[PDB]
Amino acid sequence: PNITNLCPFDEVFNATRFASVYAWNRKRISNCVADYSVLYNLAPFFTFKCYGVSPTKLNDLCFTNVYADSFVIRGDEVRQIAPGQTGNIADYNYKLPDDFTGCVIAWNSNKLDSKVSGNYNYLYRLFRKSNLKPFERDISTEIYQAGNKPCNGVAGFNCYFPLRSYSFRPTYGVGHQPYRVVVLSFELLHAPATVCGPKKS
Amino acid sequence: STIEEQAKTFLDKFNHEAEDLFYQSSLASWNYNTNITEENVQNMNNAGDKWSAFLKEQSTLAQMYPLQEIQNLTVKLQLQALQQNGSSVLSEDKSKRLNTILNTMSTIYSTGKVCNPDNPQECLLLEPGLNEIMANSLDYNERLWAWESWRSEVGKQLRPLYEEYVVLKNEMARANHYEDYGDYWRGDYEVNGVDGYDYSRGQLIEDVEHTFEEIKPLYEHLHAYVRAKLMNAYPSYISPIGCLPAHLLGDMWGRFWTNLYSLTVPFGQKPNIDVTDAMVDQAWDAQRIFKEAEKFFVSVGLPNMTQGFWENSMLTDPGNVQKAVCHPTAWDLGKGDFRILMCTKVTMDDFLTAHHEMGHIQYDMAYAAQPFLLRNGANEGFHEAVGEIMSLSAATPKHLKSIGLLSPDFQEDNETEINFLLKQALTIVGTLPFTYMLEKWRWMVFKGEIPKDQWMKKWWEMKREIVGVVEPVPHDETYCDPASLFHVSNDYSFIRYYTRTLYQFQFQEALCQAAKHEGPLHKCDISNSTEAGQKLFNMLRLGKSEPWTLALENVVGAKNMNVRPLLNYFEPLFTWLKDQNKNSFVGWSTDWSPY
Ligand SMILES: *[C@@H]1O[C@H](CO)[C@@H](O)[C@H](O)[C@H]1NC(C)=O
Ligand SMILES: *[C@@H]1O[C@H](CO)[C@@H](O)[C@H](O)[C@H]1NC(C)=O
Ligand SMILES: *[C@@H]1O[C@H](CO)[C@@H](O)[C@H](O)[C@H]1NC(C)=O
Ligand SMILES: *[C@@H]1O[C@H](CO)[C@@H](O)[C@H](O)[C@H]1NC(C)=O
Ligand SMILES: *[C@@H]1O[C@H](CO)[C@@H](O)[C@H](O)[C@H]1NC(C)=O
Ligand SMILES: *[C@@H]1O[C@H](CO)[C@@H](O)[C@H](O)[C@H]1NC(C)=O
Ligand SMILES: *[C@@H]1O[C@H](CO)[C@@H](O)[C@H](O)[C@H]1NC(C)=O
Numbered sequence: 001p002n003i004t005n006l007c008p009f010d011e012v013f014n015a016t017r018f019a020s021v022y023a024w025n026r027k028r029i030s031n032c033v034a035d036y037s038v039l040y041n042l043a044p045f046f047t048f049k050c051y052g053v054s055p056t057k058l059n060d061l062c063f064t065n066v067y068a069d070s071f072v073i074r075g076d077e078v079r080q081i082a083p084g085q086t087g088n089i090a091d092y093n094y095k096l097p098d099d100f101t102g103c104v105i106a107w108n109s110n111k112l113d114s115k116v117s118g119n120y121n122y123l124y125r126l127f128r129k130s131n132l133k134p135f136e137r138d139i140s141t142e143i144y145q146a147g148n149k150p151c152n153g154v155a156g157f158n159c160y161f162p163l164r165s166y167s168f169r170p171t172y173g174v175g176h177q178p179y180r181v182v183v184l185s186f187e188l189l190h191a192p193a194t195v196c197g198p199k200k201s
Numbered sequence: 202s203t204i205e206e207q208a209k210t211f212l213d214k215f216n217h218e219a220e221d222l223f224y225q226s227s228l229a230s231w232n233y234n235t236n237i238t239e240e241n242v243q244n245m246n247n248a249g250d251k252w253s254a255f256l257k258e259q260s261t262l263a264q265m266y267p268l269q270e271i272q273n274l275t276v277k278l279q280l281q282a283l284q285q286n287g288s289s290v291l292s293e294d295k296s297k298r299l300n301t302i303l304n305t306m307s308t309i310y311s312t313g314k315v316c317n318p319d320n321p322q323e324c325l326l327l328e329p330g331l332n333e334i335m336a337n338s339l340d341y342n343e344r345l346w347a348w349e350s351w352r353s354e355v356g357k358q359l360r361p362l363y364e365e366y367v368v369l370k371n372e373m374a375r376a377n378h379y380e381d382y383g384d385y386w387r388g389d390y391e392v393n394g395v396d397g398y399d400y401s402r403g404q405l406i407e408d409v410e411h412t413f414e415e416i417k418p419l420y421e422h423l424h425a426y427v428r429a430k431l432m433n434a435y436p437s438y439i440s441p442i443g444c445l446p447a448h449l450l451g452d453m454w455g456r457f458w459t460n461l462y463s464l465t466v467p468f469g470q471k472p473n474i475d476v477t478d479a480m481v482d483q484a485w486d487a488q489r490i491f492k493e494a495e496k497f498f499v500s501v502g503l504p505n506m507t508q509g510f511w512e513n514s515m516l517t518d519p520g521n522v523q524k525a526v527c528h529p530t531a532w533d534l535g536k537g538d539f540r541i542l543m544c545t546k547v548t549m550d551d552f553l554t555a556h557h558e559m560g561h562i563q564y565d566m567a568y569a570a571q572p573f574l575l576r577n578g579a580n581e582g583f584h585e586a587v588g589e590i591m592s593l594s595a596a597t598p599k600h601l602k603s604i605g606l607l608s609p610d611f612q613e614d615n616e617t618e619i620n621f622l623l624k625q626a627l628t629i630v631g632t633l634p635f636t637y638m639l640e641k642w643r644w645m646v647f648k649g650e651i652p653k654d655q656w657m658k659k660w661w662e663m664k665r666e667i668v669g670v671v672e673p674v675p676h677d678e679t680y681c682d683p684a685s686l687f688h689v690s691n692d693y694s695f696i697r698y699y700t701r702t703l704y705q706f707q708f709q710e711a712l713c714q715a716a717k718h719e720g721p722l723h724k725c726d727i728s729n730s731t732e733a734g735q736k737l738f739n740m741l742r743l744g745k746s747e748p749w750t751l752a753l754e755n756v757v758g759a760k761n762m763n764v765r766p767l768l769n770y771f772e773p774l775f776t777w778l779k780d781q782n783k784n785s786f787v788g789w790s791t792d793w794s795p796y
């Protein structure tokens with residue numbers, strides 16, 4: 001039948017500002033029609049690494065809920081948003097499960113997210129005591145203790161502020177330019193799946 | 202929980218905050234160097250100040266970790282690099298006096314003006330005029346006047362300055378658990394803690410002696426030939442049995458002999474290989490020159506240039522309204538940013554320098570995966586050596602015939618190879634004994650082997666004994682004749698040129714046996730050879746993380762400095778010099794018989 005009520009992918013993809021990778025935004029997508037053919041057909045969206053589902057058959061399989069996690073990282077850590085990899089982003093900021101059903105989308109945003117003075121509004125967590133659970137968000141600013149004496153909240157010797165800043169500049173190499181990453185996770189629940197793609201006449 | 206993890210976390214914090222207080226410093230220095238304006242001057246000053254203060258406080262926080270309980274070699278190397286005091290170990294008054302001394306040496310050398318007596322209405326500076334009068338004049342007494350006047354003025358205005366400078370630097374080195382300041386400078390080659398690859402500070406000098414003992418015969422033949430050609434230049438003033446007069450070496454100090462090519466040509470009837478006319482007739486602009494150098498580097502297998510390199514580099518002089526430093530410099534700004542500042546003219550020399558600086562940029566590009574404090578050459582010679590091998594390979598006639606600069610009907614006979622090799626010998630072998638003499642004199646004067654009132658007598662004797670060059674007139678200790686050079690007056694290590702010169706031909710032999718070259722070494726090209734590029738990139742990717750002995754064993758299959766590649770490079774020039782030195786006398790006498 002005649003289709004309307006498109007899923008709000010424009011508020012996720014064409015947003016003016018994305019969140020930091022430590023405080024990654026999660027948007028739930030339900031009860032709408034999800035046209036994935038727009039994302040595949042845009043040439044600036046260079047990396048379309050989809051895991052657990054084929055990108056050609058994304059338009060027919062229907063899912064219960066779609067989770068859009070949006071953040072900004074550098075060029076070299078785009079490969080770390082994947083199952084089984086390790087590093088600062090995988091351990092401390094955003095961890096993907098090994099049985100991950102969903103696609104990742106990443107594109108360069110050097111024209112938008114870089115300033116000549118340098119952009120300091122984007123932060124990542126560098127030191128955590130334990131590796132993160134999958135899909136866990138940690139927004140704590142407690143002082144990281146690398147030594148033996150207690151820090152007591154004062155960033156002195158062997159006490160570091162756990163969150164640093166990505167100083168994006170329009171003059172950085174491809175491995176240090178800002179990359180906007182949106183991860184779509186597709187989940188099925190005992191509930192009737194109401195997030196489906198369009199049907200052709 | 203342990204000390205090593207504490208060191209690792211501290212080093213991670215240090216590596217981040219530093220890749221940023223550097224890229225801000227390097228961007229500001231770049232904006233000053235391409236645009237000389239006072240706001241760029243103060244930007245460079247504030248960023249240099251914030252960078253020096255950052256490393257001061259980070260070394261203060263880094264010296265709280267003792268090194269004897271760290272077993273990982275990379276963390277130990279990074280902490281050894283970080284914990285170096287520098288000038289901070291002294292009291293504040295002596296450090297301030299040392300910085301004042303260094304600044305006034307810089308201002309005396311930069312603003313040193315020496316001109317003719319009785320003509321004071323204007324006078325002539327060293328870099329504009331004295332270089333030209335040393336390189337272009339053919340008059341004996343004119344060069345003698347310029348030489349003696351400049352050496353006299355600078356020696357009288359620098360001798361007590363060096364007298365205090367040696368004492369302050371000796372106190373700094375003995376406070377830094379070094380034997381002398383010479384031990385502090387030889388400590389750059391020191392390797393400790395690695396089994397089989399251990400290298401001490403003291404061995405390098407005898408290693409240099411072991412190389413120089415085999416350097417000395419080839420240079421002797423070149424010296425005899427130069428003496429014969431100087432017999433053509435100066436009939437009666439130079440003695441056949443004696444050493445060369447000091448103010449006849451084509452430069453102010455005798456460091457390079459390349460200004461003697463007109464006088465010392467082997468075959469003047471043969472043309473040179475200057476390809477400037479072919480570039481200017483076909484309008485070869487600088488952008489496509491760098492594109493051609495990139496094509497050479499992707500022919501050998503190295504990765505090509507970044508897009509930001511082509512966007513951000515200034516490969517042409519910008520104009521009259523914007524003033525820029527004309528020195529060719531390769532800039533590694535950090536964060537994957539690589540630029541070349543070069544005001545290119547359409548000549549063959551600028552073509553070779555563009556190949557040299559793109560080799561510099563490739564060397565900086567390869568160790569980008571290393572941690573920040575390990576992002577350097579394995580020693581101070583490798584970084585310039587890997588650019589000089591590219592300058593060697595790009596200058597071959599085969600490469601110029603490959604890229605269309607040289608005609609396919611060019612005849613490569615042995616005579617043009619002989620005169621090209623003599624030009625390369627005047628550039629390369631001539632500077633080796635001057636460099637070894639100057640560094641060994643400086644090592645003994647820092648060690649205290651040379652007494653304080655015996656400097657000039659010892660120094661000139663060294664120049665007589667090592668370089669085979671005699672002074673025009675005797676000089677007493679009111680003069681400081683060493684201090685007239687740029688590097689010694691501004692606190693620079695000088696043995697890097699000797700080690701670079703040896704490593705250049707060692708790397709050239711290693712690549713030419715990697716590329717299966719079946720002839721002599723000077724007609725070899727590493728183009729279109731992927732295995733040689735892989736063999737080189739195996740060393741370029743290490744950076745400073747491994748000992749330089751291990752990198753040398755990775756390239757040339759030897760763990761120690763070798764002079765055999767250098768004499769193998771100049772073998773046909775050596776046989777030619779043996780052929781035409783039959784009438785002349787090889788060797789010199791220490792008497793002052795020439796002058
Ligand atoms: C965002 O803007 C582009 C502009 O070309 C448009 O094509 C696209 O439909 C918009 N929405 C999304 C979700 O990309
Ligand atoms: C160089 O500096 C001057 C003075 O600040 C400025 O007017 C000019 O635009 C600068 N040139 C460039 C290429 O930025
Ligand atoms: C030293 O630490 C680094 C971590 O940066 C590690 O990769 C390396 O394997 C360690 N060295 C040894 C010999 O274990
Ligand atoms: C640096 O100087 C301080 C002050 O004298 C000293 O305590 C420290 O041991 C020095 N460190 C090194 C590596 O020489
Ligand atoms: C470098 O080479 C790669 C392929 O080898 C190519 O994709 C890239 O565009 C090249 N870069 C430039 C600046 O030409
Ligand atoms: C060059 O080769 C020719 C013929 O082989 C020979 O006669 C001549 O002496 C050689 N000259 C030099 C400088 O090698
Ligand atoms: C190297 O390869 C390029 C392209 O294949 C070719 O044009 C060039 O002539 C080769 N170099 C030599 C020395 O043959």
